[PDB]
Ligand binder design. Structure first.
Ligand SMILES: *[C@@H]1O[C@H](CO)[C@@H](O[C@@H]2O[C@H](CO)[C@@H](O[C@@H]3O[C@H](CO)[C@@H](O)[C@H](O)[C@@H]3O)[C@H](O)[C@H]2NC(C)=O)[C@H](O)[C@H]1NC(C)=O
Ligand SMILES: *[C@@H]1O[C@H](CO)[C@@H](O[C@@H]2O[C@H](CO)[C@@H](O)[C@H](O)[C@H]2NC(C)=O)[C@H](O)[C@H]1NC(C)=O
Ligand SMILES: *[C@@H]1O[C@H](CO)[C@@H](O[C@@H]2O[C@H](CO)[C@@H](O)[C@H](O)[C@H]2NC(C)=O)[C@H](O)[C@H]1NC(C)=O
Lengths: 108, 173, 53, 173, 173
């Protein structure tokens, strides 16, 4: 005869979520909470651009090593960018004292 | 599951119901069709929305430079920093994963809730004017045109209007 | 490579979208960053158990 | 809510009932009145009390001086300290707020539980000697003076003592 | 408890049933006996197992030397280290204990779930061919030899095969 049924939504989604009691539970809707992608670019932070040193370490840049872009134009920055092994640092050998501190304080 | 409706007596879902999460399937002569109950579906969307926006929007994060660089006579400091970083990473990893697990279980149980409560809502309207056929389905004793169905959907059903015919058709069964 | 994009979280390999609470890209970051976790998958269900047929 | 009793089929609450959280309203000739079911109410007070006293009393805190003062060649140390403080504050803020949310939901669901279970307790005692009128209410077929009501309240009801009169009054309905 | 089956209408447990967590007791002439429903029991073992293995297996811990030793002009550093250690210990103690509490409650509620859902599974098969005697027990109107019982256990029951006899035995009751 006549009928009224009560049921629930379903679709083609294959999203799986882990659960306390059961794992790989296929669900209709889901949301990611875990960022796992980077844009492979050194963007600028909160409106301020980083300081580019190109080929020099902080020591070379601030001492005025003859081969470093002194970047007189730069009046503010958010963070500093070196390379793994900068090429032009203390061109006349010697020890730079309290170097980690200075790097820390010139960071921004 | 935890309430025995989803994956319980209601064996599966309706791929044909796109109007929302919770709904109805009727079978009056005039024809069939699927509908959604926008009250319960909407309350569920608001609740789940608030949950997710509560796991996300609650993360305050100051401006922070995680990195610290030390020399060769500052190994104690370097290992202390390392100890801080690694400690926080352990905490957030553990609490984050268990949070996701527990609240996923909670969400599924919450949907199961809404469906069972809906089934009971319909049942409390049809006490003797219908029987519990199969699962998530009632068979009427009186014929219920579209008007009557849409009446069950919006809560108003009008029982004594159909009580007599039902009283007849039920006796021989 | 350096670029003109703007972001609120920076990491050696490249900037991050800082809207979600957790990440797994790189531990040492600079900015208003998500928290680093040793997790492959942190996915939360908003819908219900999908049982088509 | 999650069980469909509070804000569900029971539309609202009884401002006149001060004896406790859960209770009864009877309507025998002798007169009306409100009462509370001290068993379930007391179990709920013990449970909730234990919850709150478990969120508070579980906070061990050693004697600690959060402040550290550094000079101008100790910026690495100063930022490390800052990093520790800010990290803990982030953790406790997030976990505290989500804890309050989740457990508030759990508490409301717990009350909804207690009321539904109470309704069912009454229903399983009155199977055919009464009908489910309206919501959170039963109408008797046999008249039930104060003594009988107070019997339903303390569990003992004595069904076959009133089964015959009910069998009569029910037929014509 | 939260669903009113364990410590609810089912007053206690069956010390004689060793086949599992959930099961049956039948009383057909041929004789009595206890059995277990391995489907629900096994699903519960898988779920709980996954829970515990989720609270344990989720603890990543790097190789770490907690101890740091300082001299007499490094009290700021020593109190900083002390501050880190003490902070983490506070966090893990609090979160660990509340986790155990909350998840114990959740587990007990989960068992209560499984039992109530099982009771309802049997009820939905026997609508008019039986009555709800006592608690966690049904009395048949037609006599149900071992084969029939083992039918209720594996889901298949075959109702219209026994509907007539029941229709007879029920009228005078
Ligand atoms: C900035 O960095 C560049 C790259 O390192 C420096 O130039 C390099 O200087 C080294 C000496 O330390 C040169 O290596 C030597 O070359 C001679 C032959 O010229 C060879 O016989 C030695 O055995 C040794 O390998 C290297 O060739 C040279 N590279 C270039 C491209 O010039 C430069 O001196 C640095 N600038 C400052 C200011 O420090
Ligand atoms: C940084 O220094 C490197 C040197 O290692 C420069 O690389 C040279 O670039 C020129 C032309 O750009 C090439 O002809 C050379 O062969 C490169 N040298 C090597 C060793 O590969 C690089 O150009 C410098 N970058 C800046 C911005 O000054
Ligand atoms: C940064 O992350 C947020 C959240 O992960 C992204 O917002 C999502 O956008 C997609 C498509 O617009 C939606 O399907 C999601 O539902 C959104 N999530 C939330 C939480 O609102 C945002 O698009 C990301 N930004 C960039 C530039 O990638």
């Amino acid at each position: 005869e006549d009928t009224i049924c009560i049921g629930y939504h379903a679709n083609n989604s294959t999203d799986t979520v882990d659960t306390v009691l059961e794992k790989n539970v296929t669900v209709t809707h889901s949301v990611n909470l875990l960022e796992d992608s980077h844009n492979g670019k050194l963007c600028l932070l909160k409106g301020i651009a980083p300081l580019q040193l190109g080929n020099c370490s902080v020591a070379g840049w601030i001492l005025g090593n003859p081969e470093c872009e002194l970047l007189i134009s730069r009046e503010s920055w958010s963070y500093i960018v070196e390379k793994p092994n900068p090429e032009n640092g203390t061109c006349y050998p010697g020890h730079f004292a309290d170097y980690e501190e200075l790097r820390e304080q010139l960071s921004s | 599951g935890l309430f025995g409706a989803i994956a319980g007596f209601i064996e599966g879902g309706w791929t044909g119901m796109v109007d929302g999460w919770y709904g109805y399937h009727h079978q009056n002569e005039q024809g069939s069709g699927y509908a959604a109950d926008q009250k319960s579906t909407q309350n569920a969307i608001n609740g789940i929305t608030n949950k997710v926006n509560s796991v996300i929007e609650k993360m305050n994060t100051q401006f922070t430079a995680v990195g610290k660089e030390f020399n060769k006579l500052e190994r104690r400091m370097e290992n202390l920093n390392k100890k801080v970083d690694d400690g926080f990473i352990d905490i957030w990893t553990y609490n984050a994963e268990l949070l996701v697990l527990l609240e996923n279980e909670r969400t599924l149980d919450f949907h199961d809730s809404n469906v069972k409560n809906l089934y009971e809502k319909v049942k409390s309207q049809l006490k003797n004017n219908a029987k519990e056929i199969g699962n998530g389905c009632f068979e009427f004793y009186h014929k219920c045109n579209d008007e009557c169905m849409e009446s069950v959907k919006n809560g108003t059903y009008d029982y004594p209007k159909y009580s007599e015919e039902s009283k007849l058709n039920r006796e021989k069964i | 490579p350096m670029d003109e994009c703007d972001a609120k979280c920076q990491t050696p390999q490249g900037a991050i979208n800082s809207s979600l609470p957790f990440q797994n890209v790189h531990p040492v970051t600079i900015g208003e960053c998500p928290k680093y976790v040793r997790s492959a998958k942190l996915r939360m269900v908003t819908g219900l158990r999908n049982i088509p047929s």
